[PDB]
Symmetry: C3
Subunit: 316 residues, 3 copies
């Protein structure tokens, strides 16, 4: 059984918290992705597999989510497992219950917990107190490891080899921490990176220095130019929010500058992959949603299979 | 296997969006109802069947619901399928995500979506963008096709043949669109229809003309008279809301006029079936809830089996 | 099959509403607890059992909950059953639907309902109208029978024989109705009870008289003294809320008086069991959470297996 053989191999994910991309190796991720491909084939054949039938996953989201909370629910159920989605707004959180009490409560009922919480330190709280694996679905928006895993998987699935690709990040590269996580995962590969942002929203110096240290920094630009677009293999977009500028007029100019529409794609390659972790506002125009190069819906689908692979490893 | 044979037959529901009663034929509905009866027998025997074990249903309600959202959850699970109920109030809808982005997101995880949304055009959005079947659970309250299906099923189950029945609609026949949908489904049958409403809440002219064209209009009345009641086989009630009248005094008089209580039933037939799509306020009095003719709880139960039949056809 | 044999025996829980501890006998609870132990062994072996595969449980919480709503969901799913958690804040309750209409609605879809509602009389509404078993998860905070069952189970599991134990209740013994329910369950056993509370929050006279009638009242004290602690086998704590005192200064003094921390445990026995139904505020200090005598997390876990035993009896 192809999947049974892969799931039997050693893995850093097994029985592990999944809190940071810094916990995992290139080899860890290659096995994850191999399993994800087999999960997709299994789902195509069977819909709901028989991998985690005796296991129960809690999801615990203190901040809004559609992709991350629903995809983990679907992934668990499509492994044959059971899910318990916790509605924090009507839980005893409303009576003052701390995060560490909530996690120890749910650990009595479930075999693992997916957590999204507004305090960056929630992952330290989880490590200290929670006696079952916790999967970080977002800690004060600092990290989101399974978003990073699925972003990298999307690139590999869409284009094949990483060698020689040029990846262009556009938008808010300061508060867009998915960019930072993906930069870390890219450190193993012979890629080149272009960074397009307002000066104010450039990468933090430590993340820029990671690209320099890996020999990957190709250019930083305030403009999304034809030349930058024409060499782009992956165009990875982030949302720019109004709070990032003192004036609405500057916010609107910046949005106009970075909006991906047909006037943008005309300068891209025929094979350029447009990605966005979502949700989006208007920074990728609706008019390109049926273009072959609009990959941000496929990206979500790749996320399902990546999360199936992850849950099976953590909880097998 | 009786059910397996029925589910193998051709059906307009298979792999279809379910957006309007106008999509489906009398023959479509007869097969649906035959399957619904077998679903009930299966549930009586087994509780949870093995029909949709590898399938996943998302429910996506932007407006309050008890019957429609819970019955679809229960129907799917009682087919052996899996459900993912999406809480819109804590989803990325709260971060601005459009309906079409939400539908394409959930289509990555699920095999069909039940949608209730306040924009009548949500069904056009679904048709344009959603790559899995969408079942309309209410579009700006304009249509609610599975409510219409279960309303018709209820009549057939309670009384048998449609031939010769007199159906009396009472309450708000202008904003009570379930009345309009049921009128459309009744166009095939030799029934007679009585319409009891304030003048202001009469049927729209196009719906009245449907009854005229079918030779079914028996009378329009502002009063729920003994004579109207005495010829009623089905008394189908809708909620009248305070916003429908400029003054509270007129609202209260209208409510008093149309309230179904024991003083009403004394004029009805011993076999009259009292229906209401629910929720109700006070327009059907609590005092008649244990009367044999109070069919609005049985109506909800018939809805479960109708929705089991529907989901099995759409997703088989 | 050990569990199959126990589940086949007669039980007052079978096909019963579970509304009050006064419905059930010592023999009823002993069978429940025997089954709970076997449920734990089953879950350890299999994760998800095959006991209630064809059954569906609705949960219906009008007030916040983490333990009770999640544990019943997990218990049902770990029996192999299906769950439908109803979000009241987005249900037709928001359109005015009464409790009795909501219960009769959900009874069309499910085989039993867990209810938590702010009206003490909700249990009478359920008995009158609901045609499937209802399990009281809290009725205007007056009773919470499965909390009482799991509290008693926790004592037995932690200490073994009830004979000769001294149980010390501390905090708000007037509004802390779990204390009153546990007092009722303790009436069969040769225990002694100490009551530590502000004068204002002493037991109601009828509950005090129950302890007197059973020969169990050892002392009432405003102070949590070394002498009281040194004879305590079970220290059962309740939350004291600010509304219980006219002034904040008195509230803070009372909290300081009754807070369980290391300075408290130094006077307790090495075998003292510290319990709390939860949620807690600060009345049990975080610093003792990893002490062997801190049993309030294990208490929640015992609750899962108790509720598995309960659901299997009610719905087998």
């Amino acid at each position: 059984s192809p999947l049974q053989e892969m799931l039997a191999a050693p893995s850093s994910f097994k029985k592990s918290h999944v809190l940071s991309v810094t916990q995992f190796t290139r080899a860890d991720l290659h096995l994850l992705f191999q399993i994800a491909q087999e999960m997709r084939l299994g789902v195509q054949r069977e819909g709901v597999l028989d991998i985690l039938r005796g296991k129960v996953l809690c999801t615990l989201f203190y901040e809004p989510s559609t992709r991350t909370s629903a995809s983990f629910d679907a992934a668990m159920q499509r492994l044959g497992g059971r899910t318990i989605p916790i509605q924090t707004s009507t839980s005893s959180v409303q009576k003052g219950e701390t995060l560490q009490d909530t996690l120890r409560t749910l650990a009595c009922y479930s075999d693992a917990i997916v957590l999204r919480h507004p305090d960056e330190k929630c992952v330290d709280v989880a490590k200290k107190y929670c006696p079952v694996p916790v999967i970080n679905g977002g800690n004060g928006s600092k990290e989101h490891p399974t978003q990073a895993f699925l972003d990298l998987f999307t690139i590999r699935e869409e284009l094949g080899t990483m060698q020689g690709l040029t990846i262009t990040f556009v938008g808010d590269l300061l508060y867009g921490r998915p960019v930072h996580s993906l930069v870390y995962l890219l450190r193993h590969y012979q890629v080149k990176v272009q960074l397009v942002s307002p000066k104010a929203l450039r990468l933090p110096p430590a993340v820029r220095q990671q690209l320099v240290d890996a020999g990957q920094l190709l250019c930083e630009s305030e403009a999304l130019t034809p030349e930058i677009l024409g060499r782009t293999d992956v165009l990875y977009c982030t949302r720019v929010q109004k709070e990032r500028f003192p004036s609405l007029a500057e916010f609107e100019a910046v949005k106009d500058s970075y909006r991906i529409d047909y006037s943008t794609l005309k300068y891209a390659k025929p094979t350029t992959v447009v990605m966005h972790p979502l949700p989006r506002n208007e920074e990728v125009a609706e008019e390109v949603d049926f273009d072959q190069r609009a990959a941000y819906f496929r990206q979500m689908c790749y996320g399902l299979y990546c999360r199936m692979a992850l849950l099976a490893l953590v909880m097998s």
